[PDB]
Structure 1
Amino acid sequence: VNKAAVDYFFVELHLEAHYEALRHFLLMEDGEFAQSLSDLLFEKLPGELLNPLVLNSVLSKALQCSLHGDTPHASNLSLALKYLPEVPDVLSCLELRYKVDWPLNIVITEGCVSKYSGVFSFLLQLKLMMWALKDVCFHLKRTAMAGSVQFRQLQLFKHEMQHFVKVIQGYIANQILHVTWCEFRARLALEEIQRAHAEYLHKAVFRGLLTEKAAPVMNVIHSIFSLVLKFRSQLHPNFALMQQSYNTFKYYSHFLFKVVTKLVNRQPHLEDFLLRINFNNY
């Protein structure tokens, strides 16, 4: 019975498809979609951008630019919200919930999808850097004749701040999308499906620095992300005001390398982080 119950799921209801499809949309694995959804929302920034006429329609405009999807799976992407923002920070709360039907709802728990929304709002927040930072890299391009010490010494800050974001992202693109997906894909091949899924996502939120155990490691990330946003505000009338900002950035980054090292004695997942943040330096 059990062997005929599990087999009924794969060869008839495509359980193997739903997993490898929700990852294409929620965990932002499929490019040209997050790079098109986040890119649209970030173009605006209150009363706007909150009614179901723009955010409930920006998705139906996003899926067309995906070049992957537009299937019965591709629907049921309710791009809803869970808070009404009043008014430089690094927060924009917004959910993205999948939807299923009866014979599949009994396996994919209504609590597991809720944790995707936990790991999603982080991953979207990351895109806010690689776009805003891309803006100042593009905003400075039109400034070019104007070659002096004040100019070249300024641009070296961006290359010094961008590399830190392009390495913490490269970490996320290795743990939460590839190795945690190696398991739970060669692991599957009826009760086990509930626990195996409860172990796939749980490793994705554990290696994702969202667990309260390693929370102090996450608190420091905001200090980094905040200073890059301030760096975007000052798009040389106020050079020194920016020179102080970068010096605060080099201090906090130098503090992260110590707080992660002290947290090695007490987690093999964090081990790969120090090898990422540190390479031919101290």
Structure 2
Amino acid sequence: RTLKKDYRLVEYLQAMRNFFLMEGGDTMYDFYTSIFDKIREKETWQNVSFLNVQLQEAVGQRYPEDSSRLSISFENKLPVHTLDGLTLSYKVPWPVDIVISLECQKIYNQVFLLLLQIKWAKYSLDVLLFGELASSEPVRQQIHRMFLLRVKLMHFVNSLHNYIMTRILHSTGLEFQHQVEEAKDLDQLIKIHYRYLSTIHDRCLLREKVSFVKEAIMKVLNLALMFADGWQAGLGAWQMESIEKMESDFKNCHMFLVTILNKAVCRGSFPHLESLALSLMAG
């Protein structure tokens, strides 16, 4: 009771979700939209001063309490890997320092950066408009092949989004929300949070045993990037063969991923993967 009324751990975990776990949607939405606008325009985005300015401008609007803990100092293979190493911090006042560790901070950063990458892919798909390409028969056929590849890609990315939503976050967050109330012990609650974060980490495919798995998906994710630039570059930067080879790579990755999912599920490796299986074979 003293910690709950005094140090406001409930609010601390709420901010944890809001920022590190994609719940302060509008703010970080705008933040990474600006970041992706900077990236696509070849603009300065790695600027640490720019990052801190953006972070503070974002957080102060809704959470002045958090407009201090949120700090971006990121410093810098694949266009997705450009987002790797993102810097993000939090303020854990003692005796809440016992609750939150630096390993906790690192895992939060990992999950947040995976969220940022998937949101980057989603934003890249969303920003393109069919009118954007139209304003910019073989050309028509190339446009159709663009359209088919984009539809396939968007279905994949939407399945990924929904999987992140509920397989890893909605259910895990709801469970931790309930189970924190039921833990009257400091050690018990610490164990609860540790297990909740470990479960989120595992559902985020971050374990080594499935690294190749994610190594497959991010490649497809990377295929979006030059796709979107190729979407905006008109059809003079694409031909029949370019689009068709992109789609062949996509389909090879898709079949490989479906096979891997089926094998792993039949082996009983993990029961939340079948979600991803059904999502992949949904279309």
Q: TM-score range by the shorter chain?
A: 0.7 to 0.9
Q: Give the conservation status (yes or no) of the 8 Å contact 2:48–2:72.
A: no
1:138 offset after TM fit, Å? 5.6
For residue 54 of structure 1, what is the aligned residue in structure 2? 50
Say which SS state the counterpart of residue 102 (structure 1) adopts.
coil
> What is the RMSD of the two structures over their aligned residues, measured on CA atoms?
2.4
1:60 offset after TM fit, Å? 2.1
Q: 1:103 to 1:88 in 2, by over 3 A?
A: closer
Question: Percent identity between the aligned chains?
Answer: 29
Letter in 1 for 2:95: P
Deviations 1:229-274 (CA, angstroms, capped at 9, x unpaired): 2212323333222222122112211210001111121411212221
For residue 151 of structure 1, what is the aligned residue in structure 2? 143
For residue 278 of structure 2, what is the aligned residue in structure 1? 275
Question: Residue 72 of structure 2 is aligned with which of 79, 85, 95?
Answer: 79
For residue 207 of structure 2, what is the aligned residue in structure 1? 211
1:194 offset after TM fit, Å? 1.6
For residue 116 of structure 1, what is the aligned residue in structure 2? 108
Question: Residue 162 of structure 2 is aligned with which of 167, 170, 189?
Answer: 170
1:76 offset after TM fit, Å? 1.3
Query: Counterparts of 1:176 and 1:257 in 2: how far apart (Å)?
Result: 20
Matches within 5 A, 1:129-148: 129-137=121-129, 140=132, 143=135, 148=140
Would you say 1:89 and 2:97 are equivalent positions?
Answer: no
Would you say 1:10 and 2:8 are equivalent positions?
Answer: no
Matches within 5 A, 1:10-49: 10-45=4-39, 48-49=44-45
Query: Counterparts of 1:150 and 1:109 in 2: how far apart (Å)?
Result: 52
1:212 offset after TM fit, Å? 1.3
For residue 260 of structure 2, what is the aligned residue in structure 1? 259
Deviations 1:3-36 (CA, angstroms, capped at 9, x unpaired): xxxx211122211111012110111122112211
Letter in 1 for 2:73: A
Which sits farther off after the overlay, 116-125 or 128-137?
A: 128-137
1:109 offset after TM fit, Å? 1.9
- Any stretches of 5+ residues in structure 2 without a counterpart? none
Question: Residue 232 of structure 1 is aligned with which of 224, 228, 241?
Answer: 228
Which is richer in helix?
A: 2
1:137 offset after TM fit, Å? 3.1
Q: Give the conservation status (yes or no) of the 8 Å contact 1:78–1:98.
A: yes
Query: Counterparts of 2:71 and 2:197 in 1: how far apart (Å)?
Result: 21
Deviations 1:184-220 (CA, angstroms, capped at 9, x unpaired): 2111222112211111111110111111122221111
1:88 offset after TM fit, Å? 6.0
Question: Residue 193 of structure 1 is aligned with which of 189, 201, 210?
Answer: 189
1:99 offset after TM fit, Å? 1.4
